Design an enzyme around this catalytic site. Structure first.
Site, short mmCIF file in Angstrom:
data_model
loop_
_atom_site.label_atom_id
_atom_site.label_comp_id
_atom_site.label_asym_id
_atom_site.label_seq_id
_atom_site.Cartn_x
_atom_site.Cartn_y
_atom_site.Cartn_z
CG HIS A 1 78.60 -23.05 -76.21
ND1 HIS A 1 79.77 -22.37 -76.51
CD2 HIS A 1 78.97 -24.28 -75.73
CE1 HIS A 1 80.81 -23.16 -76.23
NE2 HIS A 1 80.34 -24.35 -75.75
CG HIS B 1 74.23 -15.04 -78.79
ND1 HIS B 1 75.03 -13.96 -78.50
CD2 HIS B 1 73.60 -15.40 -77.64
CE1 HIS B 1 74.90 -13.67 -77.21
NE2 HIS B 1 74.03 -14.56 -76.66
CG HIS C 1 70.42 -17.71 -74.95
ND1 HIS C 1 71.49 -18.43 -74.50
CD2 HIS C 1 70.88 -16.43 -75.13
CE1 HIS C 1 72.57 -17.64 -74.41
NE2 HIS C 1 72.21 -16.41 -74.81
CG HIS D 1 71.22 -12.44 -75.25
ND1 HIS D 1 71.75 -13.40 -74.44
CD2 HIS D 1 69.99 -12.12 -74.75
CE1 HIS D 1 70.88 -13.64 -73.45
NE2 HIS D 1 69.81 -12.84 -73.60
CB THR E 1 74.53 -15.70 -69.65
OG1 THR E 1 74.57 -15.83 -71.07
CG2 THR E 1 73.76 -14.45 -69.26
CB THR E 2 78.86 -18.24 -71.65
OG1 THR E 2 79.49 -17.18 -72.38
CG2 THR E 2 77.48 -18.44 -72.22
N1 LIG Z 1 75.09 -15.14 -73.62
S1 LIG Z 1 75.58 -13.55 -73.68
O1 LIG Z 1 74.80 -12.51 -74.32
O2 LIG Z 1 75.74 -12.96 -72.36
C1 LIG Z 1 77.27 -13.55 -73.91
C2 LIG Z 1 78.05 -14.51 -73.16
C3 LIG Z 1 79.46 -14.59 -73.28
C4 LIG Z 1 80.18 -13.73 -74.14
C5 LIG Z 1 79.48 -12.69 -74.97
C6 LIG Z 1 78.04 -12.65 -74.79
S2 LIG Z 1 80.59 -11.78 -75.86
O3 LIG Z 1 80.77 -10.43 -75.37
O4 LIG Z 1 80.60 -11.68 -77.31
N2 LIG Z 1 81.95 -12.58 -75.40
C7 LIG Z 1 83.23 -12.04 -75.98
C8 LIG Z 1 84.32 -13.04 -76.38
C9 LIG Z 1 85.70 -12.63 -75.84
C10 LIG Z 1 86.11 -13.05 -74.56
C11 LIG Z 1 87.38 -12.67 -74.07
C12 LIG Z 1 88.23 -11.87 -74.85
C13 LIG Z 1 87.82 -11.46 -76.12
C14 LIG Z 1 86.56 -11.83 -76.61
C15 LIG Z 1 81.64 -13.55 -74.48
O5 LIG Z 1 82.54 -14.30 -73.93
ZN LIG Z 2 73.38 -14.69 -74.60
#
Ligand SMILES: NS(=O)(=O)c1ccc2c(c1)S(=O)(=O)N(CCc1ccccc1)C2=O
Ligand SMILES: [Zn+2]
Ligand SMILES: NS(=O)(=O)c1ccc2c(c1)S(=O)(=O)N(CCc1ccccc1)C2=O
Ligand SMILES: [Zn+2]
Lengths: 251, 251
Positions: free
Chosen positions: A60, A86, A88, A111, A192-193
């Site tokens: 992704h 990461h 985009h 980000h 955003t995911t």
């Molecule tokens: N594209 S973005 O900058 O907004 C972004 C999007 C999604 C996620 C993250 C960042 S995350 O916080 O590392 N993360 C943490 C992973 C995680 C999820 C649940 C429990 C423990 C860790 C994400 O899911």
């Molecule tokens: Zn992001």
């Protein structure tokens, strides 16, 4: 979950149907000047070569896991620690930033994801007010080669395969961001995911970072995603503000 | 711990010597006008006569327990539920507000304490940013009997004894608050008694509420505190901002 095709993101995560999602279109005319927004402060971001960092093609994005000890304050008493960064991006001649400015999508976006010091782990922070904070910067075409980015971009060929990773030496993480830490937009939004949890503080730099045309081509052209398809256009659709006001640290 | 006498609060709660404590001295000229600060929303506060409400003398204040369903919002998706309210006050000829404005201490102060709806329990919210939110208003002397306050003040004699409590009829909690919900100061601080947990969003109304001299007297002069002592002067000295900018919803 994919960018483009099924399954829908509300099926994966109920929070992906929240009212207050990211990314957004920043309209600087409508931003509220907020003199309480002080320059961002970073500590511990100039990393030595060892220990090395894991750089992963997760299908992704390309993601660099950051080590302990990278401290970021949004202001007095608003303290965070960096988890990961990461990127985009788009495709050949197509922009791929997640945020837009007055409808303008930039070539790419970085980000830097952070956890509030009040929480030990991300799953306690999800959905909680200011539990996570993302620093976001647009990447734009420039004349010179960005040497900070070259350190990462030169290693993308090793992780072309989806779900592949490599170890890279530490670098100045702050040199991947603009030098101006005083001029930015701030709003509250979401990941955003999936799981798209809200309570996230987004800080979007006004100053951009410049990559060379080749550097941007390396980014958008090297990595592979799900199926036998390229990893391109890895940005979510702009989301309505729904009455949120974006603050600006500057008039 | 006690008001106006040892032990010194950092020996009871080291938290009390945090950098970001409450109350503070508000200086309107130095407050930052932040146009994103929208009018407070308070729904469900107009309670019917039944069920009745617990009003307790706890030796530190008089505390009214609020039922479920008092919903409050500081901003879009930044919601809260009211838990309780209590007062701070001085003595004969002496004001006892907690917050101050350019050095002026007001006769008394009401605090309505809320829990972020992102947290199921108060104990999860303690020390977390935005986990608790307090609405604060100053009470001054005015010519008229205040009939909202009279419902509480007229019941203080039944609970004069420290640790005693009574049931009171439901009342309109919103009637205890100032007129204009669009005009307020906001900063992040702490509980004003041990355990002096930080991450508390304080919203101090610009406008005050008025009580008669006889009502203020009744408040300061009726209740008994720890030992064989008068429950009076139950406020905390103001605390340094330590870089915090107090925001204002109005120019
Ligand atoms: N594209 S973005 O900058 O907004 C972004 C999007 C999604 C996620 C993250 C960042 S995350 O916080 O590392 N993360 C943490 C992973 C995680 C999820 C649940 C429990 C423990 C860790 C994400 O899911
Ligand atoms: Zn992001
Ligand atoms: N002056 S004041 O508004 O700021 C104030 C002062 C002290 C306290 C509270 C408020 S509290 O949050 O109810 N609270 C709750 C304590 C508590 C902790 C865990 C579970 C239940 C209650 C306090 O001690
Ligand atoms: Zn209080």
């Amino acid at each position: 979950w994919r960018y483009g095709g099924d399954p829908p993101w509300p099926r994966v995560s109920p929070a992906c149907a929240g009212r207050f999602q990211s990314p957004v279109d920043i309209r600087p005319q409508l931003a509220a000047f907020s003199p309480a927004l002080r320059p961002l402060e970073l500590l511990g971001f100039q990393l030595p070569p060892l220990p090395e960092l894991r750089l992963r093609n997760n299908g992704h994005s390309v993601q660099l896991t950051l080590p302990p000890g990278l401290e970021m304050a949004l202001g007095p008493g608003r303290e965070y620690r960096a988890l990961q960064l990461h990127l985009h991006w788009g495709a050949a001649g197509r922009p791929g930033s997640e945020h837009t400015v007055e409808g303008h999508r930039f070539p790419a976006e970085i980000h830097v994801v952070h956890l509030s010091t009040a929480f030990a782990r991300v799953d306690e922070a999800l959905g909680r007010p200011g539990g996570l904070a993302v620093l976001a910067a647009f990447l734009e075409e420039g004349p010179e080669e960005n040497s900070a980015y070259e350190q990462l971009l030169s290693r993308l060929e090793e992780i072309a395969e989806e779900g592949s990773e490599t170890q890279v030496p530490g670098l100045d993480i702050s040199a991947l961001l603009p030098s101006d830490f005083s001029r930015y937009f701030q709003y509250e939004g979401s990941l955003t995911t999936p799981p798209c949890a809200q309570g996230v503080i987004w800080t979007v730099f006004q100053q951009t970072v410049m990559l060379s045309a080749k550097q941007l081509h390396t980014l958008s052209d090297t990595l592979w995603g799900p199926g036998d398809s390229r990893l391109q256009l890895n940005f979510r659709a702009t989301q309505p503000l729904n009455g949120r006001v974006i603050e600006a640290s500057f008039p």
